[PDB]
n-acylmannosamine 1-DEHYDROGENASE (Flavobacterium sp. 141-8), 1052 residues
Amino acid sequence: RPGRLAGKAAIVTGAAGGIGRATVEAYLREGASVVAMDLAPRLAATRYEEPGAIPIACDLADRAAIDAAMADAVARLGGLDILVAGGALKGGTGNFLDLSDADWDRYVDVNMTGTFLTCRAGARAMVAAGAGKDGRSARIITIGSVNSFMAEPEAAAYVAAKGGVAMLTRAMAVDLARHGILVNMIAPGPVDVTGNNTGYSEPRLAEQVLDEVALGRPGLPEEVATAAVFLAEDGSSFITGSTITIDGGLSAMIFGGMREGRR
Amino acid sequence: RPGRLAGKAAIVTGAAGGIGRATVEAYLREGASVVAMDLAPRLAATRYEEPGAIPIACDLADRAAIDAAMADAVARLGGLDILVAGGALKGGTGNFLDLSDADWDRYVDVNMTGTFLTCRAGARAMVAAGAGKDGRSARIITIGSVNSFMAEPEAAAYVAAKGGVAMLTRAMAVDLARHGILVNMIAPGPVDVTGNNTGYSEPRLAEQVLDEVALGRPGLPEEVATAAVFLAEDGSSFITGSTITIDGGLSAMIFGGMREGRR
Amino acid sequence: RPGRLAGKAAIVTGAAGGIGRATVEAYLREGASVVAMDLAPRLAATRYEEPGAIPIACDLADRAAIDAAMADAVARLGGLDILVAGGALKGGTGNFLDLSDADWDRYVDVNMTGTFLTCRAGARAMVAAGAGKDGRSARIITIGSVNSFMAEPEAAAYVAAKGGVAMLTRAMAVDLARHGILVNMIAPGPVDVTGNNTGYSEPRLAEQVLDEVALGRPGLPEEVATAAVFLAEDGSSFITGSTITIDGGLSAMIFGGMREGRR
Amino acid sequence: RPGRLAGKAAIVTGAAGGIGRATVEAYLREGASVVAMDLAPRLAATRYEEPGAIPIACDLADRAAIDAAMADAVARLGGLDILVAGGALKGGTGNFLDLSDADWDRYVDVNMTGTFLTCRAGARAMVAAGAGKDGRSARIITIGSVNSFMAEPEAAAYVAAKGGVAMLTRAMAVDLARHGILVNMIAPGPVDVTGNNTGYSEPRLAEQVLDEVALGRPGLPEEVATAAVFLAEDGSSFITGSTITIDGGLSAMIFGGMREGRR
């Protein structure tokens, strides 16, 4: 309860996942009160390595549930200082030519619209709790991806929606600056969320990770969570509309397979 | 019928608008056969400065109509070489805090999903007409905005959807490269579409155009259309996944109001 | 046709190289008067597939020679409308740790400072010849690289100098807009300049070209030259401070080696 | 608390300036041993709000002095874990057309080449001290600017050199990943370094800060220093080749002067 986020009230969505779980834990460790949101069965199966998380189920596909769960969360926290919008469908479908309406809609509705609705409700609660008055500020952090800027193959709906989130983040930063809410995105590269170092073990994918990531491995959840603490703390008071990219150099490098040690 | 696009079959959406009309005209002038798509009443009121456009009505909010109009267009052209996806709702709503579900949905459904559906159908027609076989290639050009990368105030749905289109464009470039379809975006800055130099005449907006656009004026439709010809022609055979930005230096400059001549 | 650069006076540096030679030829083809600049021995061994080039030797490492050669060029052309700054040392040195003062200096002095000096002279000549008066405009086009934004391994001086040129391009665009000079960069990806399809034939490099370039091949000089014509023509009158990227999708894609057809 | 940089050996250049001083102090506060480098007279007039800084004079224009001062620093620290390359000439000259060889050279030589030379020495020392062996890693952090990506008017040499540093940062990240050195840039927007809130008080500049920065004010040094601690700590172990942008939303927003509250 001492810590870099001492006394802050935080909601983390996608909180049963690798990045969300690590963020919930880092946040509790840094003294925040934390509501953990995810799908009901996923929350039911998750136990945090730190105690005190308040689990509240919230299906991002259900618009009424997003509002209800956000109001419930805010009532229980007594306010809202920090929102980490990390809930998302992951992965690919196949070639763009074969991408169905159903899959397009699921990724856009859950990942893009779900983020918008969560963040609009969070932003309104922050303002209602005093953000932008008496020197009080608040924090919205979206979880995007390197896919917000450059495209993986065979995932056009996921990639499109990550671009949607990138620019939603900047629109929110611009409109909410006057309300004392700072809004930024975290863009993770490949992150192993298995707990087992098995997420990227398929040989071809394993070789590609060695060639395309400068550090030559997938990331760990904690390596992303640390940026969620950084963006949320009071000291980040001039950082808004930005992305912190956490990808072992993937997006910084070309012809990584030609480098000494790999070629 | 001689010209840099001689013998090409092209569909332009948003073809009643400033940029779409200029593109239809440039394309006819460069020898392409051109289907012009837009809302029925908007097409009915538009006469092109060049003859030979084939008007086909297509409401982007109607998913079945997108497919039907695309098949009708392709049948009449006898194939498909070029698609310019320019149909879009423009402009703002107000602050992000007050942005309604209805307005979010309209911008995402028309501008982002409408572009996806048009482009998926176009891409499938290109392939069916021989793209990626016997040295035959095709061209998909999306009309985005400087808002695909940096946010205007009070337009979070429009801006989000432009980011969606930015990354859709790159996903399409990656998945369709093997099918000989090159996919790029055009990112216009402020473009006066009134025909009257009245689009940016409001004093405060007029002052901002002088300060934030290096060239110190809004663009004209023809200045955007010329890039649609460039991307569509055979010579652009190594350009894919890119954006051509046409904004008088807006996105290249900071503190433009401090420059000599303005300060 | 009427040439798209009919009557224009152009200087192209790096004119003995692949991209420069292709640009000189495209420009003569489109009706421009062209001065071709490169190192003396390189000019002496180059014959253009189009006639009329005025060869003028100019070593980028010799500052006095940059000014003298520019004044001579401008006197012979009777003015200056277009400058393509393409002269550059290419390629790598080894790891950053072992990069010598001498190599650093050679890349920075030739590729960055050489570009600055050529462009400052050119810009001054353009203004002296009437740019920015009576509706007259001019064009400065820099040849950068995908290395202007993302780094290849083992070429830190080349990559740094390309970033230098990227931001010099934007500075110039901002400062010269009031003088009617539009300034843009071309960012080529891998381009085979051998004439032989042997530039990227080394097996590991060949495999990386297939995995990292969406189009799965190196570019050809003409595929870059076409953008130089596009940027230089009167129609591109609202394009400044921008980059046209010509890289087969390299900079738009991640995990290209995982795509169907490659994995 | 335990300091987040407990036991780490750091060098901070530009340490008499606003950002450097704030970084030296944050670093001492977080338990690092710190060598503070700047010009001799500037060091001599600086007293830190935290004790323990080791002041070592180092003129970035003198290449032999860069090596000697780095070797002395490393001998005194007994190694090197963190380098913050913040030393730089600031500000403008006038229009690109009038930019002299002397000014160009001063900005490039000090800000770009000075950074390269400091970082190459630092990187070598880090490797000699055990970086990349036995799980040991190190950190190079460059201080760039929003001018690394978008140009201010009338400062072409400063802006170019900032682009240089942006891409040097990525080159270093790629080449040094195998040596366990993570390399990132901090891109500050306008930062008031007067201590007095007088840096941006000139009326036209003040109005532009309100219109172009979402937060509507200049930053403070501590708001940049906090990112230097974040990047340097062990937790940031998957962040390399990236930029953290600290600019109140400047680079994320267009037509900021049109937003409600400003228009």
About this structure: DSSP finds seven helices and seven strands in chain B.
